[PDB]
Write an enzyme that holds these catalytic residues in place. Structure first.
Site: not given
Ligand SMILES: Nc1nc2c(ncn2[C@@H]2O[C@H](COP(=O)(O)OP(=O)(O)NP(=O)(O)O)[C@@H](O)[C@H]2O)c(=O)[nH]1
Ligand SMILES: [Mg+2]
Ligand SMILES: [Mg+2]
Ligand SMILES: [Mg+2]
Ligand SMILES: [Mg+2]
Ligand SMILES: [Mg+2]
Ligand SMILES: [Mg+2]
Ligand SMILES: [Mg+2]
Ligand SMILES: [Mg+2]
Ligand SMILES: [Mg+2]
Ligand SMILES: [Mg+2]
Ligand SMILES: [Mg+2]
Ligand SMILES: [Mg+2]
Ligand SMILES: [Mg+2]
Ligand SMILES: [Mg+2]
Ligand SMILES: [Mg+2]
Ligand SMILES: [Mg+2]
Ligand SMILES: [Mg+2]
Ligand SMILES: [Mg+2]
Ligand SMILES: [Mg+2]
Lengths: 216, 154, 325, 46
Positions: C126-128, C145, C150, C178-179, C196, C251
């Site tokens: 995502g760039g963050k 992630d 990805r 997994d988060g 995010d 988002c």
RNA sequence: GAGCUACCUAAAAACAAUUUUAUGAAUCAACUCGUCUAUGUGGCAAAAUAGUGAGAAGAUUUUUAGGUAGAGGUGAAAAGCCU
RNA sequence: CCGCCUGUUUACCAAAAACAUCACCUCUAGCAUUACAAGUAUUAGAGGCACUGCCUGCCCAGUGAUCACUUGUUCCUAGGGACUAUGACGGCUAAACGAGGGUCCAACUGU
RNA sequence: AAUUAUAUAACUUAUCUAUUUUAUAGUAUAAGUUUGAAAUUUCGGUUGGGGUGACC
């Protein structure tokens, strides 16, 4: 709402939308199309209301086999478009009567307006109820339409004269002591049927069958 | 009376080669299916059509007929052909993106009422945004610049 | 019959339009219009070079005006100019990373401080991450992630920008787990956590048919998104150390996915785990960034960046929560 | 109704349709005669 | 191959009585048709018979000769007819 | 209830609500020595639709007021000229007529 | 749907006959471009049948 003259039909659609928005659609919340259902007892104009709304808003034409005798639409029908702007569809349903109609007097009113087939009840018996109700109400419209007399409360008397007015006669077997003889007689049945038709066509005049119940 | 306005607007019609005039008329009859009366009316109302080259007018009409669902009668009465392509594309899409204007569906019904065709094009840009779109003039300028860049990429 | 983009537009019209009302027109067109990209400097050797070059392009760092360790040059208000494609530096590191300016607010909002341990759940490319890495002067980090591919490119991005020596240090840790399961793994480990959660990606959903959440087959996932978001946010709240600060970024413009999720998660932590969260107000942060960003104050919690035609940097909804105990 | 009686004899119709002069009118008809002569038919036409 | 049948050209023929009127109106034969039920079912019949029905001066029925032929013909459109 | 009517159709399982039909509507064509037609726009072809009084689509630059500006459209370079004087829809007549699809009464009867 | 398509109509360059110093006419033809009256050929596999999803 007066279906034939489309009196106040426009008001229904905003009310339909307003109630739905307040309620929780749940499963159908995401669906954009709106489907509504019209249900009532037979011969209350359910099908004509669908057509009336269709022509008033979408201005296309009849979308239901409107008829003058109860039992025209036999079962359920596919969704019928009504208004494009809200994309509201009407679902037509056949008339349904609960087996229990409370007092028999309610049935007479139900038969009088034509909701139930006139055969099983019998026009002759129904015709009497019209005279009693009209006389009790005092709306002597029939005397002007049917030139018989100033007023009357005998079912036999009114039927006799109106048949003469329509020049209706029939040959009926009459039981007598010496045998069975077919002797011409005034056509009482036509008087009942013809008299009944005029009442529902508005010639006699506007009535309130339940006028007694307003005081409650 | 029809000729005098056409003559004044586009005097070069007489000098124009027969091919150019025939092609413009042929496109309407064979590619736009305009009625005979409409074809004569279009030339009179907006004689500039003859000046426009073929294969560009056809795209212009199809933009009105297909993208906007407007019928042939609608185009003739409103004189869409006179307006420039760039102005129509900017405004029409801007309305479409804002949700004001929806292309009619297959059944021919639009959920949300469209705005008047005359309002979209005939009115001035200040009045257009003030009434049709109800947006700021500066924002529309950005949209025009944005749309042009996207077209260049396309 | 309907493409995923058509369905996505339909949902916003029936739901999003009601929420925003008269603001919806401008937002609706904004999403359809091309997005605005803001170049982010890579610092390092090209630190001076890019700044001088970007000045020639007339781009101005909105962060610099806000101050008057991240600087992101952006074009002037109402400017439609496109930044040149990124190019490699002399040392072999990409000069700058093109990204949405709003995407950098969650990083700037998290109040990064030296000598901190940071977790980046579901960071993805995502760039963050890259932006956060540039802020991580002295800060151990961690990346997570759910997917691999990805995540696969995410490492490629780190190779292009992050120098090998910095990446070699444990500071940079890349994982794909997994988060929700991650919460139990390392409880009260990271002072600052940026979460995010996967969102409907309204801008991407409309434009891109591929992997669009609004596809009919993916119906099950879309309905369950609020539940998954709460669990992931709850997992981060478990993992953050006492007194830690966490930022939750979404988002989408959805009210359901943005405000109810964060408040509901706070309630869940308070009840089940008996923990308290202190709400934080970024109104002062909004005032500084008014020129380069436009917000609407209707939201009770969070600072959503509405995409505007003049400033089409949206949509980003970021809310910062501090763990009280 | 009842089929089977399609043939409604008329000598003028018969001779015009399949007669000698009718057959000779066209080469396609003359080649009908020519084949029949080859086979050996008793009657070449009507 | 249009002697069946769809259509057309040409040359012709049939229509009682009654009431309306001055007619694609009425009752009803000749005549045309084929709604219904029954029998028949290798049947009298590869579509008939007995009753019952519709039209019957008209967009009527019928006779004679000719024309249109299969990538086609004809069609008051049933994808109906063309031995 | 359905079709406006007479009429027509799957020869040999459907005769109808289907087809035709007058009236109404749309599109095409300015014309001769073989159809149309020995004709010429009140005409000929093609197709759609029951007609009939009545409600009824939109369409009908804006402001001054037959007059000027603001617009619009074009060019010449943000300026300057030039130009711009109710018809795709319903209820429905309404009566009549029907070997049409449903009903009801009366008489009648070995149903 | 794929492949073609001197049915028609059209226009373009040529051939070619008139004409005027280049020019506008036409065209027993050829080469293109544009429509398509038509001709030719086809209906993958796995999902206890079907539309949608799909998968190979
Ligand atoms: N005079 C008059 N008649 C009306 C009105 N509304 C309906 N009708 C008449 O009632 C009839 C319409 O009702 P209908 O649709 O047949 O009734 P239903 O409820 O659908 N029953 P069914 O199952 O028989 O179809 C028609 O005869 C119509 O003319 C009204 O407001 N006034
Ligand atoms: Mg035989
Ligand atoms: Mg015969
Ligand atoms: Mg013959
Ligand atoms: Mg015939
Ligand atoms: Mg006679
Ligand atoms: Mg017959
Ligand atoms: Mg008869
Ligand atoms: Mg008769
Ligand atoms: Mg007769
Ligand atoms: Mg058919
Ligand atoms: Mg045969
Ligand atoms: Mg009929
Ligand atoms: Mg008939
Ligand atoms: Mg049959
Ligand atoms: Mg018949
Ligand atoms: Mg039959
Ligand atoms: Mg019948
Ligand atoms: Mg009886
Ligand atoms: Mg084969």
């Amino acid at each position: 709402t007066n279906c034939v003259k489309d009196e106040n039909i426009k008001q229904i659609v905003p009310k339909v939308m307003e109630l739905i928005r307040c309620s929780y659609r749940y499963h159908r919340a995401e669906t954009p199309e709106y489907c509504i259902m019209v249900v009532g007892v037979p011969n209350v104009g359910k099908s004509s209301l669908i057509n009336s709304l269709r022509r008033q808003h979408l201005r296309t034409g009849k979308a239901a086999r409107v008829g003058g005798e109860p039992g025209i639409t036999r079962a359920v029908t596919s969704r019928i478009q009504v208004c494009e702007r809200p994309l509201v569809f009407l679902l037509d349903t056949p008339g349904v009567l609960a087996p229990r109609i409370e007092s028999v007097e309610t049935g007479l009113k139900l038969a009088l307006c034509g909701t139930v087939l006139d055969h099983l009840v019998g026009e002759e018996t129904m015709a009497d109820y019209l005279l009693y109700t009209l006389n009790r109400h005092g709306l002597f419209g029939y005397v002007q339409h049917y030139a018989l007399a100033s007023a009357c409360d005998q079912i036999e008397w009114v039927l006799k004269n109106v048949a003469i007015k329509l020049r209706k006669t029939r040959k009926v077997k009459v039981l007598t002591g010496t045998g069975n003889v077919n002797v011409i007689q005034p056509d009482y049945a036509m008087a009942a049927r013809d008299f009944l038709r005029t009442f529902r066509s508005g010639l006699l005049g506007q009535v309130m069958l339940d006028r007694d119940i307003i005081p409650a | 009376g029809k000729l005098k306005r056409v003559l004044s607007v586009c005097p070069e019609v007489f000098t124009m080669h027969q091919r150019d005039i025939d092609r413009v008329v042929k496109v309407l009859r064979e590619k736009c299916l305009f009625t005979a009366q409409h074809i004569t009316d279009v030339l009179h109302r907006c004689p500039t059509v003859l000046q426009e080259d073929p294969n560009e007018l056809e795209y212009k009409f199809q933009y009105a007929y297909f993208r906007m669902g407007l019928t042939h009668l609608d185009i003739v009465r409103t004189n869409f052909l006179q307006y420039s392509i760039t102005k129509i594309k900017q405004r029409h899409i801007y309305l479409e993106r804002l949700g004001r204007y929806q292309t009619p569906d297959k059944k021919g019904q639009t959920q949300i009422p469209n705005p008047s065709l005359r309002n979209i094009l005939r009115v001035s840009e200040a009045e257009f945004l003030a009434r049709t779109a109800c947006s700021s003039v500066e924002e529309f300028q950005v949209f025009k610049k944005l749309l042009d860049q996207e077209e260049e990429e396309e | 019959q309907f493409t995923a983009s058509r369905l996505a537009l339909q949902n916003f019209d029936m739901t999003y339009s009601v929420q925003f009302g008269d603001l919806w027109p401008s937002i609706r067109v904004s999403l359809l219009s091309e997005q605005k990209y803001g170049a982010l400097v890579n610092n390092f050797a090209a630190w001076d070079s890019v700044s001088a070059k970007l000045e020639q392009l007339s781009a101005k760092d909105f962060v610099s005006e806000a101050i008057s360790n991240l600087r992101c040059f952006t074009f002037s208000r109402g400017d439609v100019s496109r930044f040149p494609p990124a190019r490699l530096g002399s040392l072999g590191l990409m000069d700058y990373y093109l990204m949405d300016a709003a995407s950098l607010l969650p990083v700037l909002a998290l109040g990064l401080q030296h000598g901190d341990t940071v977790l980046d759940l579901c960071a993805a490319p995502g760039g963050k991450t890259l932006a956060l890495l540039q802020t991580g002067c002295c800060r151990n980090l961690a990346a997570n992630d759910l997917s691999t591919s990805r995540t696969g490119r995410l490492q490629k991005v780190l190779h292009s920008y992050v120098p090998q020596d910095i990446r070699e240090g444990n500071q940079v840790r890349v994982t794909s787990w997994d988060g929700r399961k991650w919460g139990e793994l390392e409880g009260d480990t990271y002072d600052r956590v940026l979460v995010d959660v996967p969102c409907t990606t309204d801008r991407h959903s409309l434009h891109e048919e591929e992997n669009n959440i609004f596809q009919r087959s993916r119906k099950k996932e879309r309905q369950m998104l609020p539940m998954l978001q709460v669990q992931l946010l709850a997992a981060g709240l478990l993992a953050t150390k006492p007194g830690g600060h966490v930022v939750y970024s979404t988002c989408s413009l959805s009210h359901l996915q943005n405000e109810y999720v964060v408040q509901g998660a706070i309630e869940l932590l308070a009840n089940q785990y008996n923990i308290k969260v202190q709400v934080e107000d970024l109104s002062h942060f909004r005032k500084l960034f008014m020129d380069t960003f436009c917000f609407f104050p209707s939201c009770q919690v969070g600072e959503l960046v509405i995409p505007n035609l003049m400033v089409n940097f949206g949509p980003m909804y970021f809310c910062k929560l501090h763990r009280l105990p | 109704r009842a089929r089977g009686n399609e043939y409604q004899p008329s000598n003028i119709k018969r001779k015009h349709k399949h007669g000698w002069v009718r057959r000779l009118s066209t080469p396609a008809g003359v080649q009908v005669i020519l084949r029949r002569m080859l086979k050996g038919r008793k009657s070449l036409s009507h």
